[PDB]
Paper text:
Bacterial ribosomes frequently stall at the 3′ end of mRNAs lacking an in-frame stop codon due to physical or nucleolytic damage to the [name] or premature termination of transcription. These “non-stop” ribosomes must be rescued to maintain protein synthesis capacity and cell viability. All bacterial species that have been studied use trans-translation as the primary ribosome rescue pathway. We previously reported the discovery of a family of acylaminooxadiazoles that selectively inhibit trans-translation, the main ribosome rescue pathway in bacteria.
KKL-2098 was added to the culture, UV radiation was used to stimulate cross-linking between KKL-2098 and the ribosomes, and the non-stop ribosomes were affinity-purified, vitrified, and visualized by cryo-EM. Inspection of the map revealed density consistent with KKL-2098 near residue C2452 in the PTC, a 23S rRNA nucleotide shown to crosslink with KKL-2098 in [name]. C KKL-2098 is positioned close to the peptidyl transferase center adjacent to 23S rRNA A2602, C2452, U2506, and U2585 and the CCA end of the P-site [name]. Third, in this orientation N3 of the oxadiazole, which allowed no substitutions, is adjacent to A2602, positioned to make hydrogen-bonding or dipole interactions that require the 1,3,4 oxadiazole configuration (note that this oxadiazole configuration has a strong dipole moment). Other molecular interactions between KKL-2098 and the ribosome include the amide oxygen in Zone 3 with the 3′ end of the terminal A76 from the P-site [name]. The position of KKL-2098 would clash with tmRNA in the A site, partially overlapping with the phosphate of the terminal adenine, suggesting that the acylaminooxadiazoles may inhibit trans-translation in part either by preventing tmRNA-SmpB binding at the A site or by interfering with tmRNA-SmpB translocation from the A to the P site. D The N terminus of bL27 (purple) moves 180° to pack against ribosomal protein uL16 and the acceptor arm of the P-site [name]. In contrast, the presence of KKL-2098 in the non-stop ribosome stabilizes bL27 in the rotated conformation away from the PTC.
Author numbering:
A (entry chain d): 1 to 46
B (entry chain B): 2 to 272
C (entry chain T): 1 to 94
RNA sequence: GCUCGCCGGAAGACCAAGGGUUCCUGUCCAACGUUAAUCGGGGCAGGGUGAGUCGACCCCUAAGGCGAGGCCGAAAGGCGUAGUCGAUGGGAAACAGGUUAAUAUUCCUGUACUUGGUGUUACUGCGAAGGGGGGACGGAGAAGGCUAUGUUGGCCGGGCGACGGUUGUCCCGGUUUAAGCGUGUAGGCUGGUUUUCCAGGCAAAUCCGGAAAAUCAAGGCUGAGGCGUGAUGACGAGGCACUACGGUGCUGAAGCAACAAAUGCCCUGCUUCCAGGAAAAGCCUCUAAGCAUCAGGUAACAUCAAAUCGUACCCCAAACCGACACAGGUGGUCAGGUAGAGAAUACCAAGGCGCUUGAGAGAACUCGGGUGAAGGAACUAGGCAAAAUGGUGCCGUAACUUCGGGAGAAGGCACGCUGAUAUGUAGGUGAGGUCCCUCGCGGAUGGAGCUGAAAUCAGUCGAAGAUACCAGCUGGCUGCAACUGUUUAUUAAAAACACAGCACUGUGCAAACACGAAAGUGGACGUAUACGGUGUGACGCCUGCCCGGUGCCGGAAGGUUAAUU
RNA sequence: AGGACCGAACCGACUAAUGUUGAAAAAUUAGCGGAUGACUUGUGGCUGGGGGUGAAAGGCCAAUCAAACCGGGAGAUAGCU
């Protein structure tokens, strides 16, 4: 049964990756909240 | 001409081809090609705007001279071609200085015929000239609305426009709708009728031919749930309401033309 | 022409293995742990300066460091760059 | 280690994705492994991924994204020009053998190739952000030439039989060799060559395009495969010497022909059809500015460079997605023998496994099966399930019909093996020989040899010859829907939806309508034989009456009537 | 030639049984439909929640849908338990 997570790292980095976050205003406000929470992994990106 | 085909399958059974023998069997003129790609009915926001479009066969774009300009150079028709873009046929045509161009194919016309654009030119089908120089009562087609702009009226495949009256700077057109329209009389038109006149004499035969022409299927409104249409829902087949568009405005009869800019040009409406 | 500081920077180490010793005795190559930014011309010019030897050509590869667990706590070794350097013939190296 | 069994269009081998050391070696059995565990994808330690030619990177662009200015928007921001990104597509080049415990088209050996500089010498119009050509393109069908590959014979090596026979028409094994280079073949496409002119290709152009005029039909392009070379090499059955029993070292014969044959190649071909089938760059060519006897251009040679990154391992799964060592999902590539139409299926090869609890016993009952007297749907809501039919050729085949069908209608007959026709036939393939030859990868003849159905007749075995696997149950009446399709992922596949066809209605183009505070976009690079909405749903015969009500359309004489004054 | 026929891959899911603390949060087995097209599939993109998309079932939109999920108003309110 074809389950939902069907990974590819190009699509992952295009969708949730760092420059994808950094392009838009709310995507920076992701990165603001994750720094201020203090996340070890910031984005998804290796 | 038409053919019916023999019903040797279901869904072959009701088909009519329009075939034409003399259309050019082979590849079109590769300067005057270009790419056109498909919308899927979706604008730059990517929402569907005009529904029931998608798919269908890959199409190139023939660049067709409507604007039609090379005045007092004679050309000669090389060949007639299918156009997937449009309902009429096109003519690859060859001027004396060795430009080739695509025109619409007018009705009489074939290979070796001679065409000439602009003001001198002899009033045969194919020729183009301003319609202060067209004599009154002609059938013409591919019709400029503004001067210099290019042919916008009567292009598709069996149509034409009537020139009823000329009063000074304007002529009056009986359009294919049965409108009457004042158009400024230094607009160009091409003589005669546009070509592929049995184009309505096709019928399609099956759903697949509509799909190859790229027409996604139409769900009628009373099938739906009433969230989806105004017509929607109801136990069994119910429809106790006035028939509307899916955004809920009346479709049987109610006129929609709002354009007060152009209303001096409309002499009489269609009926 | 490559700077003497960089040439003295490039070589970290000879590498010791069975494959090292067999390639040395047979096909006349050393293997070096080198700097991970070091390029092939840098390695060639460095070893030609710095052991005064003649070299044919150099192949590189990157080793990726293993992932270990020092007790519970997870932990990764460094990647490093590994250079197969064949000499010209009848060059000896210590 | 010896047997047994299973997969074999896979349960084998290789890639992409995804994973990230799971790979190899030593060592350990606390935990993990559905049990034990000396074993492991477990722990711990060490090792292992080598590229000018593979791929990424790079050059080029699609969908699309971002977007200087710009347009628009309370702000945020939206759209978008120049551009610049974006592969899943285009663009240069390496193969064979050998090697490690683990890598190899990367290392070693042999044999090549590509692109750039530089430097010579020979020659002389170079030059683009521009022009032109090319790249460059659909579906379906059909053969023809081939090849991979297989079979048989020949040759070479070995063997002479655990039990009757087996020196022979006997058994077993091997019989391999690439890229490149040279030749240019089956084939396909195209008339070439010269001269002159020209409203075209944004300017120019010798280039293209178009007009003339002369001359020759033979010239160009493309092209599988074969052949020669690569290769006196490597490989090679086996032998012969050692042995860390794991393997190591040395030597090494034959290495041909015929037939069959692809879904692979020629073929981005040819033929046909309509639904009319990317772009840009590399590349070829043209000239513009400019230069100027320089630069550059191409020619051989010499030399240098080709960086960086990935390269282990799994990859139809114990390593990816499913919480699991999960009966699930997962794109591409290779495709042996026999029988078979076949990639079905059966047994097998190469190769890989026996699915991580076993041992007994042989109760009920459950599950998956096999068989069954006599009856044959009496069961049941209902022939649910089971049972049954099933291949090829030939005969024959109803109502009805839109003349296509219905129809494989129904139903029946032959089927194995052996001999003869015919020591193997029809057919296919086709060597020598001979002749011609503008001379070869040529053309005729000629059939050696090889392969090889189908039928008839006769005989013979069994209960049974389409013997296993595989492989339609059929007919009659009728409701509904014309039909192929689509649908409630996970209780509904239908009469529901869609559909071709029909009708109404809107819409003259800056259209209607739709998404959008707007710009803008779709419609559509379309133009009333077009597009949108609504209802109906092939086709045949049709589609009656009512405008009182509610809508809609048209009219503007009167009444009523907002802001305003 | 064919939205032709029969039938593998492939796509689908009509019937029955098992399974229902399953091998599996929809599968296996035996049959079944399509299988050159309105087919199917890989890679990437686009459409965003009163919105999309829908051959229309109120289906689907990360095992969630008559208005997704996450955070916030928010200790909503709760004559009810």
């Amino acid at each position: 049964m074809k389950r939902t997570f069907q990974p590819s790292v190009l699509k992952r980095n295009r969708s949730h990756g760092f420059r994808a976050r950094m392009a838009t205003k709310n995507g920076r406000q992701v990165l603001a909240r994750r720094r201020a929470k203090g996340r070890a992994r910031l984005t998804v990106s290796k | 001409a038409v053919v019916k085909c023999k019903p040797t399958s279901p869904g072959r059974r009701h088909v009519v081809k329009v075939v034409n023998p003399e259309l050019h069997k082979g590849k079109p003129f590769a300067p005057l090609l270009e790419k056109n790609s498909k919308s899927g009915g979706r604008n730059n926001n990517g929402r569907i705007t005009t529904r029931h479009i998608g798919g269908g066969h890959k199409q190139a774009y023939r660049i067709v001279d409507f604007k039609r300009n090379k005045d007092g150079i004679p050309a000669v028709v090389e060949r007639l071609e299918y156009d997937p873009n449009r309902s009429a046929n096109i003519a690859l045509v060859l001027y004396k200085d060795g430009e080739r161009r695509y025109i619409l194919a007018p009705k009489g016309l074939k290979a070796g015929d001679q065409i000439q654009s602009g003001v001198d030119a002899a009033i045969k089908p194919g020729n183009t000239l301003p319609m202060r120089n067209i004599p009154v009562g002609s059938t013409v087609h591919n019709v400029e609305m503004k001067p210099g702009k290019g042919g916008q009226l009567a292009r598709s495949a069996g149509t034409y426009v009537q020139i009823v009256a000329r009063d000074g700077a304007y002529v009056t057109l009986r359009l294919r709708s049965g409108e009457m329209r004042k158009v400024e009389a230094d607009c160009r038109a091409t003589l005669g009728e546009v070509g592929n006149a049995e184009h309505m004499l096709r019928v399609l035969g099956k759903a697949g031919a509509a799909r190859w022409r790229g027409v996604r299927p139409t769900v009628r409104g009373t099938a739906m749930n009433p969230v989806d249409h105004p017509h929607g829902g109801g136990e069994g087949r119910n429809f106790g309401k006035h028939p509307v568009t899916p955004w809920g405005v009346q479709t049987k009869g109610k006129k929609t033309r709002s354009n007060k800019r152009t209303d001096k040009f409309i002499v009489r409406r269609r009926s | 022409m490559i700077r003497e500081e960089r040439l003295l920077k490039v070589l970290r180490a000879p590498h010791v293995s069975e494959k090292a010793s067999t390639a040395m005795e047979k096909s006349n190559t050393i293997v070096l742990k080198v700097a991970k930014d070091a390029t092939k011309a840098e390695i060639k010019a460095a070893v030609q300066k710095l052991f005064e030897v003649e070299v044919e050509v150099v192949n590189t590869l990157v080793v990726k460091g293993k992932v270990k667990r020092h007790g519970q706590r997870i932990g990764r070794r460094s990647d490093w760059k590994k250079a197969y350097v064949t000499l010209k013939e009848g060059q000896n190296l210590d």
